[PDB]
Structure formats: structure tokens, C-alpha cells
């Protein structure tokens, strides 16, 4: 919120490249309450150049914990543990491996088919219309059977 | 400056054993050194030349080991079936990327 | 060194065991070493096989069950006084003397290694692997075992000793002053101020040859001759004083024409009631208003000092590139490794061998663009 | 300008100054590792510190930071890399840390200072990276000092 | 323009922040600490014991959809679907064959 306007000739200028008789106090902050609890950034004035280096470096570490929360995969995960379970038990194991790690990719395959059509409108509505014919079917039938039990 | 504290030297009987150490200041890390070691009067006795890779002379293989304790920040040299030609004095050295140590040399006889 | 060819093979450990691998899993085969594209004139290199480079890397090493790629590489090593040590252009370092050897003169060179990780070859000769043809002359090659590579070096004999000091800087204008049971000397041309035990060392029992004190002399007479042969006298000899930090300082007291007139006036009135040296600080009339003119001289130099190193200091954290090449005299690559800086020789390349690409744009993307154009 | 530490922060177009407090050499120690456990992914920028204002005083943790200033915050933070080496300046004086550890404190008469403004006869070699393998396979960053301006 | 930028991105990050932390359940929580202040003490005895109610369903839905992730759950209960689906069209069938005789 603007406050007020000073003369220039309000504050002491530091005289020349070299100087003292300059007067000091040893800061203590004082930090605003909220900074404890809403996590509230505390004001650190304009960018220093070891300040933008040090944010520069917190962004890349950022972008890099977003980027593997993207690219880590529970089916890759459920791969990698698959994977050590079939090694431990040797040459029997390969021999299995070889052919369900080629089951569990077709049904990774299949999963991933099914979320893919229900991105498109026209697959979120017709499986929409399924559920409510089915349900209905269900109920309609459950009404003749509680209607023929009892004559 | 980094400091070795050099102890354990004596005097013992042929067929008896021993246990050198030096211990660093915190200057000076020994688990991080290039290498680490002890050389008789120079020749080389145990040393190691890199964090995880051992060397000793042919005459002390399987009767010499050492080790190191990153927490004490020292090193040490078991040395069993002594014999009087492995007599004379030990300098323990350590060295990081250039800046070279030595204690100062104790004497061991049998 | 027979042929140019690894064995397509190789020993690893990993469970703490053992292992042999075997490049794309066939039989042991002589596979022939060739040069790669980006080496440089100087540090050459050779691999069997360029799959780090290409794209789709991950790929290409998952189409085979093991993969093995031997390389050559000629590096620049460096090593100082006592030589107990080497560095290789590789930032890393070696833990023996490169002089050491079988030979008489060097089995008594430093070593850290054992006798079993160390072999020295005698008529050896050399194969070039991008001319396949045998070197005209013998050699000795000492051979090392690290844990992550092997290294190799021509052997030679130690060289002959040379003077323990070299000349660092000649300064024509250096102020001396007693301070504290120390001298403190200081000048515009260097902004170090170097500090001294008052007792002058006694170089002559030492240097033995006159290696630094020849040095010295010449130079201060050389200096002398060119800018104070018709304004100054010399007091006396020349004076050593080894200077914390470890430099050894050669110093040549001086009067001005002017300020020698004051001693002889002096020196004429105490007769009526020439050696400079005996008089220098004798007459606290004359000196007091000295202390006072140099001292502001001084003071002057260090105000200058602290604000020029201020903005230098500065100006290499953004860019200790073209910081460094003007303070080396010649364009080199620097980084910064926290508080210190590390430096290496960049290579030139003529201007006809460059070729610049038309475009600035990325295909693969279209979002992006390079931000500085591409060349080849 | 004012020939006494003290510590300065722009206020926009105008600077905020205060005095630094001094601490002595001796009542400062230097953690072993950079590494964060918490955290696989990130390490330390710049090595932690454990230290006293008085010698009989209560144990305080911080952060080094440029020029022998003590930071008590312990939030300069990058991605882990491979191949780091680095200097930190530490009481007239050098830590090495290599790999994220601690290896040894240097003497500031241990490396070549450069002359003040034009040096010669400087020894130099074509140095030649040689890249950790993880940097081709695991694809993980290799290091490359601090950053310039470009 | 750089440190301009700089201060761009941690507006930008602290933007995706939110969007991430900002889950419907505390959105919903909130609601109900509004109403339950307005209400006052004896509201209070209520508001304990919906407050683990609702607890429950956010537990229940979550424990379902950490269940929906796995590839095997989400095949099952696509069986289970289509086998429910199939039951209901033949029965629906069968009824319409007696229906008319
Ligand atoms: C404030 O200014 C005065 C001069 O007006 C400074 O006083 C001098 O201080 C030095 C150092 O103790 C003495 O050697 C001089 O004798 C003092 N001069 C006089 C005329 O008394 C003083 O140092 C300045 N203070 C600060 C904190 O900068
Ligand atoms: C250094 O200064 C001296 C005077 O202090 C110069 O001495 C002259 O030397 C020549 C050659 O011997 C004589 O012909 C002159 O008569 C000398 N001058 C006087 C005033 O005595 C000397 O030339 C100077 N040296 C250099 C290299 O400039
Ligand atoms: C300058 O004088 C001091 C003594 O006032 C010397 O300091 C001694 O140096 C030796 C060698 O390092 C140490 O063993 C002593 O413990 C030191 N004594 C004290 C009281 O600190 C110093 O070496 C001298 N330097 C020169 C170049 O003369
Ligand atoms: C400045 O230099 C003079 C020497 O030219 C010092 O005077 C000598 O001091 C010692 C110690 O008291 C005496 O034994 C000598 O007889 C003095 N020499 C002469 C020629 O008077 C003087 O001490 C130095 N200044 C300071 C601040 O100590
Ligand atoms: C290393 O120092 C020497 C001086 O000790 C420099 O030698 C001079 O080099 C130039 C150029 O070749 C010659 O014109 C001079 O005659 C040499 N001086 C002497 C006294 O012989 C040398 O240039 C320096 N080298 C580097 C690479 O900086």
C-alpha cells in the first residue's frame, strides 16, 4: 500500500566509494506471526545474484519432482517387482517370465484401451447408457420374480 | 594443518601380533583420502589407494590388515605372526588430492 | 599395441562376485579400434563402438543383454616438486612418481601401489592406432592398474635440479614501513601487502650458486638505470626478507634527490657543532613529515586496491571467461568450483572449417527454437 | 564502503544496512555430507554448519555461505549431480567436498593465486571430462560449477 | 528481465501448488465447520461424530479408487460389470419369452 513521497534530501547518502561516522543498528527481524502457520513467504527485498542462482536451482529441482510424478508409472513399478521375483528363482524363473510379463502386457494393453475410449465423449456416454439398461433390466426383473413368489 | 596422532608401537616375541593407528584431525577425513598407509625405513608395508582398494608388500600378505573407522576418524594396522626381519620403524602417511602428511615414526621389535 | 583390437570381453563384479560379459552376447572377438569424431588434435581417442552418441540410446542398449565398448584415450598429465604424485587432464589423481621405475636410479621413487598393479616394459614400441605403423625407436613404458582405468606413460630419467625460486614480479615502487615489531610492504602494482619479521634472512649461506642473487641485483639495476638515475639515490645493499605466505622479497632502499639534501644539511650542522644508511631514520624532524607523506601514499594504494578487486571479483562470477583470458593474456575455459576457479587451454579452429546451419528452428518440436544458431 | 562487515538488502532503489556479528574460528564445525535423506533426489548446495557465538554457549545449525558468513536457514538446495567437486572458502582457509562429502580443509597458501590483474608464465592442460558412465544410462546431470550469467 | 522472470516462475509454481493441495475433501470439511460454529455447543457434540462419518466415506472412496489404479482391479471389476450386464439381458430375455404364454 503506498504510504507516502520523501524529499531525496530525507535519507543519508553514503558519501563517496570510502567513508565512515555511519551510524547502526544490529536488525532482529521480527517476523509476522503468520509465517508459522500459513506458511506466508517473509518479504527479502529485490534479488541478489546469489538469490536468483539459488531460486534458479530450487525451479530445476522442482520441474524435476513434477516430472517424475508424471513419468512414475504403477504399472512400470509392478514391472520392476515382477522382474526380481522371477530372477531369484533362476532358469525355472526365466522360463515363466518370458511368457507372463507378456500376460501382464496384455492386460496393461487392455486397461490402458479402455481408459483411452473413455477420454471421448461418445465412450463416457455409451457405457453411461449400458449401466442405466442393465440396472433397469436387473430391477424390472426383480419386480416379476417378488410379483410371481407370492401366487 | 592436519595432524596424526600415531599409537600402538612396542615391543613383543616372534609368532606374537600387534595393533598400529593414527588418528586425524577433523581437517582431514581419512575415509576420503587418495591414499592412506604405513612404509618401514622408504618402502611401502599396507596401504589404501582408493576408498574401497587395499595394497600391501609380498612379504606381509595374509599376515597384515588394515581397516579404517570413519567416526574416530583413525586407521588401522592388525599385524599377527610377527618375525624379527618385520623390526624397525613405521611412518603412517595420508594424503588428499596433493596436500601429503606424515606422523611421526615408531618403532616395533621382536 | 600388436594390432588395435580389445577382446570383446570383460571382467565385472556385482553381487559381490565375478562376471563375464561379451559385446551383444557372442564369442570373444577382436574388435578393432576407431578414432572418435570428437577428438581433438591433441586429446585423441579411440573406441569399438559409438553407441553413446547416437540417439535412442536406452534402446540400443536394451536390444542386447550385455554391451561392452573399449576405449583409448591420450591425456595430458601434470606433475610438481617432489613429483611423488601425477594429475591426469581427467581431474584425477595418481598416487606415484612418474619418474618411478625398475631401473637403479628409480625404485627408490614414490609409490603407493603394490608391485603387483605396476609393470614397467622394456623395447617397447609404440603402434599409432590411426596410422597402423610401429614407432622408429625403443622405449620404456610404465603401466598402472587403477580400479577404474588403467594409465600408461613413457618412462624417463629425472631431470637435472634448478633454482628453489623464480622471479614473480620486479616493482618499481614498493613502500616499506615498521609496524607492530614487523615490516609491512606495499605497492600500486601488486595489491597484496606482504608482512616480515624485522631480521633480513641470510640468503648467501643458501643460495650457494647466486642463482636468486644474481637475479635480483640486474633486475633492481635494470630498473634503476630506467627511472631513478637522475631523481634518486640508493642507501645501501640490497636486503632479503622472507614475507609470510612464503616469498622470499629483495629490497633496494631509496632517498629522493630532494629529501638526501636534508641528511646533508643535517649532517653538515652536527660536523660544525656520507653514509645514508647510518642516518636514514635518525633525524625525527625529518622523518615525521615523511611518515606522514608516504603513510597518505599507502593509505592512497589499498583505497584503490579494495574498490578495483571489488568489481573484478564480481565481474568473474558472471562471466570468468573472457575474466580469466585477459588476466592469462590468452583465451581459456573457466568455471567457478564454489569459491575457487579452475581453468584449461580452450582450441583454436581456423575460420574456413566453420559452416552455419540455415535454420534456428526444431522440427521435433515446434514450441522451441535453438537460442544461439547452429554450426558444423 | 564502510570497512566493517555488515550485512545490506535493497530495498528497491534504496539499501537497508545492518552489523554482522562475528564469530571465532575455532566455535564453527563442518557437517560430513551434503546429501539429503529425506530427499533421494536433492543434496545441499552449499555444506552445512554446526557453531557456538560464545565457547561454553548453546550449539546452533546453519548453512555456510559466501565470504565466511554463516546463514541460519538451511535452504540452499539443488538437484543432485554427478562428478561435484568444490572449494568452499572456510576461515582463511579451503573445504574440499567431492561426491557431496567432506574431504579435507586446505590452507589458503596451498593453491597458486593468481597475480593481481595480469599473470604469465601459468601452467594449464586441455582438460578432458571423462563423464561418469550413470550420465549415458541413468541419464542423471552431470555437474558443471556454479552458474554464469549466460 | 531475468529476476522479473524468476519471480514469474515461483507465481507459476505456487499456482500449480494449489491446484495439486487443493482437495475437494477440505473443501468440504470447511463447509462443515462453518455450519457447526453457527450452531454452537450442542452442535459441537454433533459435529465430532458426522465428522467421522464423513471420515469414513472419504476412507472408503480413496481405499476405491487406490484399488481402481492397480491393472488387476481395474479388470475385475470390468468383469464383474459385464457379468452383471449379461445376467440382466438374459434374464430380461428369459421374462419376455413367459411374458406373452
Ligand atoms: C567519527 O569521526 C571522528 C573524527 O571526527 C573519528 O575520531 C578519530 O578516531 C581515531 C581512531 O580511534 C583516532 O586515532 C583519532 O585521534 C580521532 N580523531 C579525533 C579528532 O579525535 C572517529 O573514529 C569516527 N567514528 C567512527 C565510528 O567512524
Ligand atoms: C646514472 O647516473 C649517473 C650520475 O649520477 C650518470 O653518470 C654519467 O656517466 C657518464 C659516463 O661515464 C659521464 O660521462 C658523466 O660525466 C656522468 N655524469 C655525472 C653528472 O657525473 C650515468 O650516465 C647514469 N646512467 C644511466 C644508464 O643513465
Ligand atoms: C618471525 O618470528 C616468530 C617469533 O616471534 C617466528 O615464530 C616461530 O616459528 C617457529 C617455526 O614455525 C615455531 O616453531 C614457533 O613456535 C614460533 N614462535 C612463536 C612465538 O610463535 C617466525 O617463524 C619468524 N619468521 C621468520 C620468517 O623469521
Ligand atoms: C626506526 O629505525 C631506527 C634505526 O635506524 C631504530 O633505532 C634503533 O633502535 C634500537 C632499539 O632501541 C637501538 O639499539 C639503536 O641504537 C637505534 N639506532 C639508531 C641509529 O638510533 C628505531 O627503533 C625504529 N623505529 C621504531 C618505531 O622502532
Ligand atoms: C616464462 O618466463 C620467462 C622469463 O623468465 C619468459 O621469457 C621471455 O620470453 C620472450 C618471448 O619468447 C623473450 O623475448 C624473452 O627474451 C624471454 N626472457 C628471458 C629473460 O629470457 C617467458 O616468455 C615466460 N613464458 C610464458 C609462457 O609465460
Not at chain 1, 433397469?136 to 426383480?142: C, D, E, G, I, L
Not at chain 4, 593481481?116 to 552431470?142: A, C, G, Q, S, W
Amino acid at each position: 500500500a503506498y504510504s507516502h513521497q520523501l524529499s531525496r534530501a530525507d535519507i543519508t547518502t553514503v558519501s563517496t566509494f570510502i567513508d565512515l561516522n555511519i551510524t547502526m543498528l544490529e536488525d532482529h527481524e521480527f517476523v509476522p506471526l503468520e509465517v508459522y502457520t500459513r506458511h506466508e513467504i517473509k518479504d527479502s527485498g529485490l534479488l541478489d545474484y546469489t538469490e536468483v542462482q539459488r531460486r534458479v536451482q530450487l525451479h530445476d529441482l522442482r520441474f524435476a519432482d513434477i516430472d517424475t510424478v508424471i513419468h512414475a508409472d504403477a504399472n512400470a513399478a509392478m514391472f520392476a517387482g515382477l522382474g526380481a521375483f522371477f530372477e531369484g528363482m533362476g532358469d525355472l524363473g526365466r522360463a515363466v517370465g518370458k511368457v507372463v510379463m507378456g500376460i501382464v502386457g496384455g492386460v496393461v494393453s487392455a486397461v490402458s484401451g479402455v481408459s483411452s475410449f473413455m477420454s471421448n465423449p461418445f465412450g463416457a456416454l455409451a457405457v453411461g447408457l449400458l449401466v442405466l439398461a442393465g440396472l433397469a433390466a436387473a430391477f424390472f426383473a426383480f419386480r416379476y420374480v417378488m410379483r410371481l413368489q407370492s401366487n | 594443518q592436519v595432524q596424526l596422532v600415531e599409537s600402538g608401537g612396542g615391543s613383543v616375541q616372534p609368532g606374537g601380533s600387534l595393533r598400529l593407528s593414527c588418528a586425524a584431525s577433523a581437517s582431514g577425513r581419512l575415509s576420503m583420502s587418495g591414499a592412506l598407509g604405513w612404509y618401514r625405513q622408504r618402502e611401502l608395508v599396507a596401504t589404501i589407494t582408493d576408498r574401497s582398494s587395499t595394497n600391501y608388500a609380498d612379504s606381509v600378505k595374509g599376515r597384515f590388515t588394515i581397516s579404517i573407522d570413519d567416526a574416530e576418524n583413525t586407521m588401522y594396522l592388525q599385524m599377527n605372526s610377527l618375525k624379527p626381519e618385520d623390526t624397525g620403524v613405521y611412518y603412517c602417511n595420508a594424503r588428499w588430492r596433493g596436500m601429503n602428511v606424515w606422523g611421526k615414526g615408531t618403532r616395533v621389535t621382536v | 599395441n600388436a594390432k588395435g583390437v580389445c577382446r570383446s570381453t570383460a571382467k565385472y563384479v556385482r553381487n559381490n562376485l565375478e562376471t563375464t560379459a561379451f559385446h551383444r552376447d557372442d564369442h570373444e572377438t577382436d574388435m578393432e579400434l576407431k578414432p572418435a569424431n570428437a577428438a581433438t588434435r591433441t586429446s585423441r581417442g579411440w573406441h569399438t563402438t559409438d553407441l553413446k552418441y547416437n540417439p535412442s540410446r536406452v534402446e540400443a542398449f536394451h536390444r542386447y543383454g550385455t554391451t561392452v565398448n573399449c576405449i583409448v584415450e591420450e591425456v595430458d598429465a601434470r606433475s610438481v616438486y617432489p613429483y611423488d604424485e601425477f594429475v591426469l587432464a581427467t581431474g584425477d589423481f595418481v598416487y606415484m612418481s612418474p619418474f618411478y621405475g625398475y631401473r637403479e636410479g628409480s625404485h627408490t621413487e614414490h609409490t603407493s601401489y603394490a608391485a603387483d598393479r605396476f609393470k614397467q616394459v622394456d623395447g617397447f614400441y609404440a603402434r599409432d592406432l590411426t596410422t597402423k605403423a610401429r614407432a622408429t625407436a625403443p622405449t620404456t613404458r610404465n603401466l598402472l592398474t587403477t580400479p577404474k582405468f588403467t594409465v600408461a606413460w613413457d618412462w624417463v630419467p629425472k631431470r637435472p635440479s634448478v633454482c628453489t625460486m623464480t622471479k614473480w614480479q620486479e616493482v618499481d615502487e614498493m613502500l616499506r614501513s615498521e609496524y607492530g615489531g614487523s615490516f609491512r610492504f606495499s605497492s600500486d602494482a601488486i595489491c597484496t601487502t606482504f608482512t616480515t619479521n624485522l631480521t633480513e634472512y641470510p640468503l648467501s649461506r643458501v643460495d650457494l650458486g647466486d642463482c636468486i642473487g644474481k637475479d635480483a641485483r640486474d633486475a633492481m639495476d635494470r630498473i634503476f638505470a630506467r627511472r631513478y638515475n637522475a631523481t634518486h639515490i640508493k642507501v645501501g645493499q640490497p636486503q632479503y626478507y622472507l614475507a609470510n605466505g612464503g616469498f622470499l622479497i629483495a629490497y633496494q632502499p631509496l632517498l629522493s634527490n630532494t629529501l638526501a639534501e636534508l641528511y646533508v644539511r643535517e649532517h653538515l650542522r652536527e660536523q660544525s657543532r656520507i653514509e645514508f644508511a647510518r642516518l636514514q631514520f635518525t633525524y625525527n624532524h625529518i622523518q615525521r613529515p615523511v611518515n606522514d607523506m608516504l603513510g597518505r601514499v599507502a593509505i592512497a594504494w589499498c583505497e584503490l586496491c579494495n574498490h578495483e578487486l571489488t568489481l573484478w571479483n564480481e565481474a568473474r562470477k558472471l562471466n570468468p571467461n573472457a575474466i580469466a583470458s585477459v588476466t592469462v593474456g590468452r583465451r581459456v575455459s573457466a568455471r567457478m568450483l564454489g569459491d575457487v576457479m579452475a581453468v584449461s587451454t580452450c582450441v583454436p579452429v581456423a575460420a574456413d572449417n566453420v559452416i552455419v546451419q540455415n535454420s534456428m528452428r526444431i522440427s521435433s518440436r515446434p514450441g522451441a527454437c535453438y537460442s544461439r544458431p547452429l554450426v558444423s | 564502503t564502510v570497512g566493517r562487515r555488515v550485512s545490506a538488502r535493497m530495498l528497491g532503489d534504496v539499501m537497508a544496512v545492518s552489523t554482522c556479528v562475528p564469530v571465532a574460528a575455532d566455535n564453527v564445525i563442518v557437517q560430513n555430507s551434503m546429501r539429503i535423506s529425506s530427499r533421494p533426489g536433492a543434496c545441499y548446495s552449499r555444506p552445512l554448519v554446526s557453531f557456538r557465538y560464545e565457547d561454553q554457549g548453546p550449539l546452533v545449525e546453519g548453512q555456510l555461505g559466501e565470504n565466511n558468513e554463516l546463514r541460519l536457514t538451511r535452504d540452499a538446495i539443488e538437484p543432485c549431480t554427478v562428478g561435484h567437486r568444490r572449494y568452499f572458502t572456510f576461515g582463511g582457509g579451503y573445504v574440499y567436498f567431492e561426491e557431496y562429502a567432506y574431504s579435507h580443509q586446505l590452507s589458503r597458501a596451498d593453491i597458486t593465486t593468481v597475480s593481481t590483474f595480469i599473470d604469465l608464465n601459468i601452467t594449464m592442460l586441455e582438460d578432458h571430462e571423462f563423464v561418469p558412465l550413470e550420465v549415458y544410462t541413468r541419464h542423471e546431470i552431470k555437474d558443471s560449477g556454479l552458474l554464469d550469467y549466460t
